[PDB]
Structure formats: C-alpha cells, structure tokens
Curated annotation (Swiss-Prot):
Species of origin: Severe acute respiratory syndrome coronavirus 2 (2019-nCoV)
Localization: Host endoplasmic reticulum membrane
Assembly and interaction partners: May form homohexamers. Interacts with N protein.
Regulation: Inhibited in vitro by GRL-0617.
Record function comment: Responsible for the cleavages located at the N-terminus of the replicase polyprotein. Participates together with nsp4 in the assembly of virally-induced cytoplasmic double-membrane vesicles necessary for viral replication. Antagonizes innate immune induction of type I interferon by blocking the phosphorylation, dimerization and subsequent nuclear translocation of host IRF3. Also prevents host NF-kappa-B signaling. In addition, PL-PRO possesses a deubiquitinating/deISGylating activity and processes both 'Lys-48'- and 'Lys-63'-linked polyubiquitin chains from cellular substrates.
Reactions catalysed, as given in the entry: Thiol-dependent hydrolysis of ester, thioester, amide, peptide and isopeptide bonds formed by the C-terminal Gly of ubiquitin (a 76-residue protein attached to proteins as an intracellular targeting signal)
Stretch of the intact protein here: 1027 to 1191 of 7096
Listed name of the protein: Papain-like protease nsp3
Membrane topology of this protein: Multi-pass membrane protein
Domain Macro as annotated: residue spans: 1-165
Amino acid sequence: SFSGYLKLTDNVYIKNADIVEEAKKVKPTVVVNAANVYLKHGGGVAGALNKATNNAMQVESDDYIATNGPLKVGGSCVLSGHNLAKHCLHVVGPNVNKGEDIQLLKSAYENFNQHEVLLAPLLSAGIFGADPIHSLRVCVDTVRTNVYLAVFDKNLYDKLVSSFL
Ligand SMILES: CC(=O)c1ccc(OCC(=O)O)cc1
C-alpha cells in the first residue's frame, strides 16, 4: 500500500519517488501517465512507464490511437496498467514547450476525479515545461479524490513541500 507520503491536504499526498518504482511496489488501481495527445511514450514519465511495461503500453496505445484518434489536450483515456497498475490513466496536460495552453491544466486534473485513488505525477511538470509549484496548486484545488503524487526530483520535492500554501 502507499507508504512514506506527506499529507498536503485531506486528499493530496506527496513523496519524493520514481513513479515507476512506486507503481511496481504498490501496483495501485490507477497509475497516471503524463501522456501527449498521440500517446507516444517517448520521454519523461511516459517513456519511463512504457519502458517498465517492455513497450506493451506503447503497442496498446498505438492500437488505441489507430481506433480512436488522438486525445485532446486536457483529456484522458483509461488503458491497461500492465505490470504496473490495474489501469493507466493517460492524462494529457498542456505542454508549454509545445506552445500549449497552460489554462488547460485544470481540465487535465479533472480527469483524476473519475478515480477514487490514483498514483500520479505532477501534470505538465518536467519536460512539459510548466511550473511544478503551479501544477501542485492546480492539483490541490481541482482533485477531490485521493491522489498520491510521486515527484522524482529531490530538490523539486523539497521546494514543493517547503513552498506549499
Ligand atoms: C514477467 C511478467 O509477469 C511480465 C509482465 C508484464 C510485462 O510487460 C507488460 C505487458 O506484457 O503487458 C513483462 C513481464
């Protein structure tokens, strides 16, 4: 079960951890992927989760895209969690480095509300280019279900906890 998390609010918890390693340990009902609209799991959280599934997540995702077309920025889809979780909720946060609308971060987090408990990264953080402090603020103000945030970077984790309002 979820261990070593710091409680931020009634429903938001945070831990300095590799989300892939957290997923293998807990095998949560839902692990959130920091997806793009094409479900191309190239780098960041997506690349790491996909690599831990031995590329099964990418093969499954390519079949999903062939059938359904791309996701919307702010949107999501539920696919298999493979060896990591029961399900993977692929959530598309805005990628500021791709010139996408940061104002869509709240819509992206609203997807978490369809799941009672989730293991997740901070949306639009890392290679998506948004301010992770702002992403945690939107998470806390949008997500009402139990979210266990895994922040990979130790210095970022400390900065997020120490600056949390
Ligand atoms: C050994 C094992 O149980 C295993 C499970 C899943 C693996 O990749 C993900 C998938 O195939 O969907 C690889 C290995």
